[PDB]
Short mmCIF file of C-alpha atoms in Angstrom, two decimals:
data_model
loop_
_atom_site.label_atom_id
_atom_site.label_comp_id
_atom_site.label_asym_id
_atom_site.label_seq_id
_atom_site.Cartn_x
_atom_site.Cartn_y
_atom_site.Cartn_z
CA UNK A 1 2.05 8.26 0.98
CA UNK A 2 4.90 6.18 -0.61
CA UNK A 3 7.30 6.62 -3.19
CA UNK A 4 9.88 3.87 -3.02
CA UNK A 5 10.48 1.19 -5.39
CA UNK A 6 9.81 -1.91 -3.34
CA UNK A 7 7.51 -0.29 -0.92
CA UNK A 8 5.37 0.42 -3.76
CA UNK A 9 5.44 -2.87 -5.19
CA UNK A 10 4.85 -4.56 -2.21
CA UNK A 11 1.94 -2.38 -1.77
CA UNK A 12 0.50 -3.18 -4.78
CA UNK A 13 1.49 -6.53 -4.71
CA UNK A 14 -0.30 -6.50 -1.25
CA UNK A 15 -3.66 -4.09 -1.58
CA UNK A 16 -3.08 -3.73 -5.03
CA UNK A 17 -4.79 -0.10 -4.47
CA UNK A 18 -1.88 2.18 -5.95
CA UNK A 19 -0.38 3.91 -2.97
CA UNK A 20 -2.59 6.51 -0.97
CA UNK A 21 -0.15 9.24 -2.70
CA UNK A 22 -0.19 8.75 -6.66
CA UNK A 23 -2.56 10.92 -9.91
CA UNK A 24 -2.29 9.61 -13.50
CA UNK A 25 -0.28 12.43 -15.62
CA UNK A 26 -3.52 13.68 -17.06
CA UNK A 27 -4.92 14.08 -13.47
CA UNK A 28 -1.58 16.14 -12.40
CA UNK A 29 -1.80 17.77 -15.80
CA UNK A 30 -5.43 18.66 -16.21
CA UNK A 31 -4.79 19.79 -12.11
CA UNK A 32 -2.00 22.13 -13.46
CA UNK A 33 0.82 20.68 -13.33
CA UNK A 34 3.28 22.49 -16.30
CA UNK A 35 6.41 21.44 -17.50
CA UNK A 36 7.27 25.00 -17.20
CA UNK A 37 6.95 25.31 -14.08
CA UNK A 38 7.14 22.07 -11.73
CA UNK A 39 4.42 23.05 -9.87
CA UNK A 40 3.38 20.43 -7.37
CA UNK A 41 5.05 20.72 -4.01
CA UNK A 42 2.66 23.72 -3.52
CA UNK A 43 -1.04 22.04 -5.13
CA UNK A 44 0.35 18.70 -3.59
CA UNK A 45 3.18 19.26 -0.76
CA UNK A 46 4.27 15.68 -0.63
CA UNK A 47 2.44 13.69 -4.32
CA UNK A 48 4.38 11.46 -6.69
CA UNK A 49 2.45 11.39 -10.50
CA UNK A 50 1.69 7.79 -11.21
CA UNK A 51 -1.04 5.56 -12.34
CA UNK A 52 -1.66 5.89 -16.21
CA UNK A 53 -2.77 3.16 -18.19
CA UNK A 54 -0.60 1.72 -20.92
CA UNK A 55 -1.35 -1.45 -23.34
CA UNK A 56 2.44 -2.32 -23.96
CA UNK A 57 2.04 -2.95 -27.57
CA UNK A 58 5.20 -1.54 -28.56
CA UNK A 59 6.66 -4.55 -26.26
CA UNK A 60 9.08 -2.51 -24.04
CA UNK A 61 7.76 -4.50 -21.07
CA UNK A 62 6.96 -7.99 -20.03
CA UNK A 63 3.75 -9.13 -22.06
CA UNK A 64 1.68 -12.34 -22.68
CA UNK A 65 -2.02 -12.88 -24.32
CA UNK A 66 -3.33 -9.37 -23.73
CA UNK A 67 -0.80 -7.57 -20.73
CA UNK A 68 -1.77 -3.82 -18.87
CA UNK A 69 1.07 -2.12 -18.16
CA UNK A 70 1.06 1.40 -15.98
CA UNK A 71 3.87 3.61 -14.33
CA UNK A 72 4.76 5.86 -11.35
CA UNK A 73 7.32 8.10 -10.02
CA UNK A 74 9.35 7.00 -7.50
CA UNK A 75 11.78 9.09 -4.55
CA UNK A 76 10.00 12.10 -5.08
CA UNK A 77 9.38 14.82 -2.33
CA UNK A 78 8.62 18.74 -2.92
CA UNK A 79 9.60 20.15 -6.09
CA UNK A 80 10.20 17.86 -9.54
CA UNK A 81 10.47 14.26 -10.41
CA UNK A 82 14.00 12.70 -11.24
CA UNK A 83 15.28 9.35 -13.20
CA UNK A 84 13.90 6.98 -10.50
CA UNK A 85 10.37 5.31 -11.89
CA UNK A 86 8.62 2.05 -10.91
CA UNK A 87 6.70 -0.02 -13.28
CA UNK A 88 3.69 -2.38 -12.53
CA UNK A 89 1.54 -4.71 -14.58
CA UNK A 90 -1.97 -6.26 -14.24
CA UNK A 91 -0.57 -9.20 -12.92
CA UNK A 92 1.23 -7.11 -10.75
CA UNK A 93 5.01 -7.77 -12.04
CA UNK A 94 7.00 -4.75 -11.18
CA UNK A 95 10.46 -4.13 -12.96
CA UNK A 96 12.58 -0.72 -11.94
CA UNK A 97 14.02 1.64 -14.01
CA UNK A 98 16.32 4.81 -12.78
CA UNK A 99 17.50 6.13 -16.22
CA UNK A 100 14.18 8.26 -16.74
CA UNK A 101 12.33 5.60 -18.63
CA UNK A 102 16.02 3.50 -20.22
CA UNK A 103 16.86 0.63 -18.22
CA UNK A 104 13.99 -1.83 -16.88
CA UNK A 105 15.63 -4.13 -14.36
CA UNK A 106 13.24 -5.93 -12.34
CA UNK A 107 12.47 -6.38 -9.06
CA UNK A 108 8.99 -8.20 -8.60
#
């Protein structure tokens, strides 16, 4: 049940369990979540989407001999997302981003 930038870094950085509140896209997808529609604050009164698995080939964040890189939405509460998105990497770095997916300034 978090959706803040720091709070969920330090979460993961703490449990590293992704924070008691997130779904990968496909999970929020395959759930029925539609771009036409927003639907969530109904199915999930109070869920940020989050938690997808990414290699980071195309190099857009930090890397090294083999990285994982994954995303989630961030200041979220009933109705659609917005420009504010966390990312996190295996080894836990998180970097911030508030331009819908532009601008990755760090912050772990």
């Amino acid at each position: 049940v978090i959706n803040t930038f720091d709070g969920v870094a330090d979460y993961l950085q703490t449990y590293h369990k992704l924070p008691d509140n997130y779904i990968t896209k496909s999970e929020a997808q395959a759930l029925g979540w539609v771009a036409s529609k927003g639907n969530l604050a109904d199915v999930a009164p109070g869920k940020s989407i989050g938690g997808d698995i990414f290699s980071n080939r195309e190099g857009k964040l930090p890397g090294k001999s083999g990285r994982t890189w994954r995303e989630a939405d961030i200041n979220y509460t009933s109705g659609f997302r917005n420009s504010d998105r966390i990312l996190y990497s295996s080894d836990w770095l998180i970097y911030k981003t508030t331009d819908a997916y532009q601008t990755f300034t760090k912050i772990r």
